[PDB]
PDB file of C-alpha atoms and ligand atoms in Angstrom:
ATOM      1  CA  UNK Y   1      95.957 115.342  82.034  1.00 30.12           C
ATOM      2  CA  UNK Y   2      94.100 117.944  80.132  1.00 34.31           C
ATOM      3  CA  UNK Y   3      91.297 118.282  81.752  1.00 36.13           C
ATOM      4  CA  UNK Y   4      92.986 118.307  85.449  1.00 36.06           C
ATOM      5  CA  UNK Y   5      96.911 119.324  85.520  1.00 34.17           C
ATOM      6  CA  UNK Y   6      99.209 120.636  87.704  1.00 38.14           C
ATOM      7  CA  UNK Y   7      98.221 124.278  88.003  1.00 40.85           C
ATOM      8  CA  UNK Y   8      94.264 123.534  87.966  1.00 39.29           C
ATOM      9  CA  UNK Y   9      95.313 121.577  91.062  1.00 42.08           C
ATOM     10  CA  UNK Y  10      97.162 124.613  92.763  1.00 39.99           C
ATOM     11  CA  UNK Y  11      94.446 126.516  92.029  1.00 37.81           C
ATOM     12  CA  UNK Y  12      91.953 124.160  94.014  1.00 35.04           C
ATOM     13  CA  UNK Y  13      94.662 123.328  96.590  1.00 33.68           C
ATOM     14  CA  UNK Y  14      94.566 127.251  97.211  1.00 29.59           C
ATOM     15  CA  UNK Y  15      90.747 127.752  97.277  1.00 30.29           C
ATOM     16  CA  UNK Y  16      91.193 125.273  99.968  1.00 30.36           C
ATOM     17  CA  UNK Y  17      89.462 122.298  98.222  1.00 31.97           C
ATOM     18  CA  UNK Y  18      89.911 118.713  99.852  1.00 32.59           C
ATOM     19  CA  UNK Y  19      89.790 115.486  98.048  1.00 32.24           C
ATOM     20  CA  UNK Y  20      86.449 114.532  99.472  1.00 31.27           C
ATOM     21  CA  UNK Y  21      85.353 118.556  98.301  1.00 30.91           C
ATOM     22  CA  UNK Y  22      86.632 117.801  94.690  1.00 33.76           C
ATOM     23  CA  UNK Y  23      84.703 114.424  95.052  1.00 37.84           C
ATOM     24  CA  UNK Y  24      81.600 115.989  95.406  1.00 35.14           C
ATOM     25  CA  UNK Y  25      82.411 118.596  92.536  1.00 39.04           C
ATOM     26  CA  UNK Y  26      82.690 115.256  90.549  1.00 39.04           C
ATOM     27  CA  UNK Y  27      79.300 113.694  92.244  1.00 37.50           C
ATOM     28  CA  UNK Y  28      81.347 110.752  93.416  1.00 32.70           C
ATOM     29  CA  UNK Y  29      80.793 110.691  96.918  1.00 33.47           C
ATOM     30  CA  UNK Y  30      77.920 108.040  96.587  1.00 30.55           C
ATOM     31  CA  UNK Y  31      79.915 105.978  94.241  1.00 30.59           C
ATOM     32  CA  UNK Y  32      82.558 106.160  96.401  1.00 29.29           C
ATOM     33  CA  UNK Y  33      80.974 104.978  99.467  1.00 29.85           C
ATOM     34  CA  UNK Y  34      79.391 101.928  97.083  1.00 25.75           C
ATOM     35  CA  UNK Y  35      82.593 101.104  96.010  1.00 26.29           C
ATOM     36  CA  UNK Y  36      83.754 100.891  99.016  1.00 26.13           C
ATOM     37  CA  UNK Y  37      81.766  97.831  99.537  1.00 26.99           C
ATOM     38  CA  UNK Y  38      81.448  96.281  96.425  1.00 30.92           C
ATOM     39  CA  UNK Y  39      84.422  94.756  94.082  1.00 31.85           C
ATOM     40  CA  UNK Y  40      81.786  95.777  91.010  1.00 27.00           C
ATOM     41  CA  UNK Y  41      81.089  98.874  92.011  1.00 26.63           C
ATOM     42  CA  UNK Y  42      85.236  99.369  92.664  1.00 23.70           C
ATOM     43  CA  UNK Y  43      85.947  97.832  89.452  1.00 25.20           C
ATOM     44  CA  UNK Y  44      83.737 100.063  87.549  1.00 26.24           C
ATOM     45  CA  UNK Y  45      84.338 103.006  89.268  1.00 26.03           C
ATOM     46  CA  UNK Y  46      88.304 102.356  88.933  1.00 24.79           C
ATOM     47  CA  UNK Y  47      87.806 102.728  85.418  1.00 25.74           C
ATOM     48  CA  UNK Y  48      86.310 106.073  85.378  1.00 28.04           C
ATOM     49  CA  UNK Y  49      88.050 109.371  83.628  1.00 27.70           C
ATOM     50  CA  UNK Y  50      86.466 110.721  87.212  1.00 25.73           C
ATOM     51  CA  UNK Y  51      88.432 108.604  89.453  1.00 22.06           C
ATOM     52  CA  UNK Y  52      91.580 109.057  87.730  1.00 20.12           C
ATOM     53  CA  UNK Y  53      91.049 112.930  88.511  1.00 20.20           C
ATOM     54  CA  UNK Y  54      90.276 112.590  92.215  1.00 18.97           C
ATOM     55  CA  UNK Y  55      93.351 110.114  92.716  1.00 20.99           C
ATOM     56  CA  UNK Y  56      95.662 112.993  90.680  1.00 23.02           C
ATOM     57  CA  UNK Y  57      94.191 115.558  93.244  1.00 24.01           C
ATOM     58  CA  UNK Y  58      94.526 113.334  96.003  1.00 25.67           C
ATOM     59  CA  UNK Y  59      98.222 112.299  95.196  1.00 25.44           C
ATOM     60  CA  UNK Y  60      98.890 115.994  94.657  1.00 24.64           C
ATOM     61  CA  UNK Y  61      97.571 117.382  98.256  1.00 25.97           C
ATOM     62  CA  UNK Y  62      99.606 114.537 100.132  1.00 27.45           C
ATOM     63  CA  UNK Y  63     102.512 115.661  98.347  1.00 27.87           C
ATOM     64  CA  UNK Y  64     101.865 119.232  99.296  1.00 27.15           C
ATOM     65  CA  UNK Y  65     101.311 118.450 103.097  1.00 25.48           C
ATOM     66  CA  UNK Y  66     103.985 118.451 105.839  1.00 26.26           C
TER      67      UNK Y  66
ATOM     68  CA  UNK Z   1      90.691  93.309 112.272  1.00 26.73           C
ATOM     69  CA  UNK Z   2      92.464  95.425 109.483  1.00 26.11           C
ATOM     70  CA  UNK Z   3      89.148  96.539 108.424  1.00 26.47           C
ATOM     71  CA  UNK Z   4      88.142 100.329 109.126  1.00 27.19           C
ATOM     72  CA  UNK Z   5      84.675 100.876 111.603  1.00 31.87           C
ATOM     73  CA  UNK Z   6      83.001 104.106 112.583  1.00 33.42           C
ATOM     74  CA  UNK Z   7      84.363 104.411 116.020  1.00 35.68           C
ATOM     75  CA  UNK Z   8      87.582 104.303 114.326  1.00 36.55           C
ATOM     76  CA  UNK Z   9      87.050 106.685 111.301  1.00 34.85           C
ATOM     77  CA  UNK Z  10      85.456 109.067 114.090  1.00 32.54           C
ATOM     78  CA  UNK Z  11      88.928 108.853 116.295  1.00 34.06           C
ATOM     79  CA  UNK Z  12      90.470 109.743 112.878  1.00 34.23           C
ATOM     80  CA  UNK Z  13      88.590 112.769 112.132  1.00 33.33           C
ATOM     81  CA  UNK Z  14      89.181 114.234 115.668  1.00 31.16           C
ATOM     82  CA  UNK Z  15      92.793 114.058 115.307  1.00 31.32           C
ATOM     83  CA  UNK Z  16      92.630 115.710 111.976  1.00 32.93           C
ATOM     84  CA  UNK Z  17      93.523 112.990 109.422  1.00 31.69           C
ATOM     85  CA  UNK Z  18      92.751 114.375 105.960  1.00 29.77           C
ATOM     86  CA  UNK Z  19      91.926 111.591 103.337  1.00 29.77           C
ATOM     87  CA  UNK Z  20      95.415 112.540 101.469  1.00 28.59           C
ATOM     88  CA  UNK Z  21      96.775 112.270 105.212  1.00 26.94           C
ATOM     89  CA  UNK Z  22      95.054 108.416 105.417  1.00 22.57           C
ATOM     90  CA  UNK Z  23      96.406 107.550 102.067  1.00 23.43           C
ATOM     91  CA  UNK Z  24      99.835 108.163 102.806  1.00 20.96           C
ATOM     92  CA  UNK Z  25      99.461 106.695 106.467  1.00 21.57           C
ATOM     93  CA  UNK Z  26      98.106 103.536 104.424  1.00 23.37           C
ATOM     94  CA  UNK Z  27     101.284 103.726 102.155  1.00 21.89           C
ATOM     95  CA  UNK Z  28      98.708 104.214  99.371  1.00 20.55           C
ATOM     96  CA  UNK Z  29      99.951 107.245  97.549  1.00 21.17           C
ATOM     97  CA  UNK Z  30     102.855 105.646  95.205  1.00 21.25           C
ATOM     98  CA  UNK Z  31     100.359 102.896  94.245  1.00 22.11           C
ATOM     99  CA  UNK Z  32      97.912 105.287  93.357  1.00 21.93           C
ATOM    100  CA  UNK Z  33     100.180 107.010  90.617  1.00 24.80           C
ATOM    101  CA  UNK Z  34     101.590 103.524  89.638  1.00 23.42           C
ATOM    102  CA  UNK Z  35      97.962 102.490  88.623  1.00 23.78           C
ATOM    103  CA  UNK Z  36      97.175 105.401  86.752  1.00 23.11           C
ATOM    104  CA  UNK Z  37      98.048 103.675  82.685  1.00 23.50           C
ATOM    105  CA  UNK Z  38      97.107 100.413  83.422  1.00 22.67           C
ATOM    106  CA  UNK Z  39      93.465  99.057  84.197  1.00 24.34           C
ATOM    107  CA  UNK Z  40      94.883  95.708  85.276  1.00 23.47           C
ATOM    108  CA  UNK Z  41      96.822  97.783  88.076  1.00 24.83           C
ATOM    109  CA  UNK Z  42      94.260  99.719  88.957  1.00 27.64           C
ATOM    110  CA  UNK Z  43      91.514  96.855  88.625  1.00 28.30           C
ATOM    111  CA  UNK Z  44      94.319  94.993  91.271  1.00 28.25           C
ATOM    112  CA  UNK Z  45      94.600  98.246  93.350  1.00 26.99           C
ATOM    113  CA  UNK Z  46      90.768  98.022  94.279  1.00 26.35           C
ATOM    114  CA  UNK Z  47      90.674  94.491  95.482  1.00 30.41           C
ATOM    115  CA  UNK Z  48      93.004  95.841  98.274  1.00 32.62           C
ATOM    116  CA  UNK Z  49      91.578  96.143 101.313  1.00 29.00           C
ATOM    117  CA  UNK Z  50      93.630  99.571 101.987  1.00 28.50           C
ATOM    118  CA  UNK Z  51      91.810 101.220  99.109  1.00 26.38           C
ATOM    119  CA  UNK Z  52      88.557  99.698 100.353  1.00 27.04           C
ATOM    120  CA  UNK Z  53      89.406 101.557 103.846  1.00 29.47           C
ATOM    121  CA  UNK Z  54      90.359 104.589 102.259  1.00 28.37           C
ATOM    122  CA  UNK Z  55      87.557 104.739 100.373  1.00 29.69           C
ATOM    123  CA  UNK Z  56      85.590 104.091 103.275  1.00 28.61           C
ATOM    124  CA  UNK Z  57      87.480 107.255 105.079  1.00 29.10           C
ATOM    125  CA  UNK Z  58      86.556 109.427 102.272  1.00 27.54           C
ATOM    126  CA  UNK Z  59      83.060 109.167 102.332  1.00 26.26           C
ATOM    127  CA  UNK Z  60      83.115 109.200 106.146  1.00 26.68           C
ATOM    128  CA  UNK Z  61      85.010 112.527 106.264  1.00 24.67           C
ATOM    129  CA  UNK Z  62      82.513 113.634 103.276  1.00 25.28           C
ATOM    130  CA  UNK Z  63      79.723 113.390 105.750  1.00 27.94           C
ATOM    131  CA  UNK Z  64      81.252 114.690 108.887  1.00 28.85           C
ATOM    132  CA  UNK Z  65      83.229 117.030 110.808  1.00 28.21           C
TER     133      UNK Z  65
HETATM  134 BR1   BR O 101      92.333 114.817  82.594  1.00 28.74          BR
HETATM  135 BR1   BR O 102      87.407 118.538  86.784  1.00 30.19          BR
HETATM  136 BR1   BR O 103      80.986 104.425  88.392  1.00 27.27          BR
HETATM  137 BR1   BR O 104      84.728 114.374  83.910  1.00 25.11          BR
HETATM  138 BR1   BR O 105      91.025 119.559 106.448  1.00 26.16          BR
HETATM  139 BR1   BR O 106      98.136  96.884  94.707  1.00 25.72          BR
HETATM  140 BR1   BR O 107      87.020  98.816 105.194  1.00 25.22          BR
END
């Protein structure tokens, strides 16, 4: 996406950034954890421009591990 | 149960899962990229319970080491 591609990601991947690191960078972590819990909370947070960027960045370290 | 508990998540942690690492143990990782254009697949996606436990994970892992 524009705002998060493949080469940002390297570039985090390289400063040694996890997915729960960028998830803080994105002040998710609490939203995270309520989502966690709650089907509203998921719903609404699955809808988010922000959670579409920490699932890119999480897809993107797996595939860079091992 | 299927469900994720802190006894667990702390087991995971000490072994060194990463939440990327849980994701992929969960067999999350294609679904995760499948969801990405559609809200009805991603809406679906979060009713799992796998999501709900990686979710969990994340926020665990957030607060400890
Ligand atoms: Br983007
Ligand atoms: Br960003
Ligand atoms: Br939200
Ligand atoms: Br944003
Ligand atoms: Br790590
Ligand atoms: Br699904
Ligand atoms: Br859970």
């Amino acid at each position: 996406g524009p705002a998060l591609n493949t080469e940002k990601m390297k570039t985090m991947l390289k400063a040694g950034m996890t997915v729960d690191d960028y998830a803080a960078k994105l002040k998710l972590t609490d939203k995270i954890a309520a989502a966690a819990n709650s089907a509203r909370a998921m719903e609404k947070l699955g809808e988010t421009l922000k959670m579409k960027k920490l699932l890119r960045y999480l897809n993107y370290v797996a595939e860079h591990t091992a």
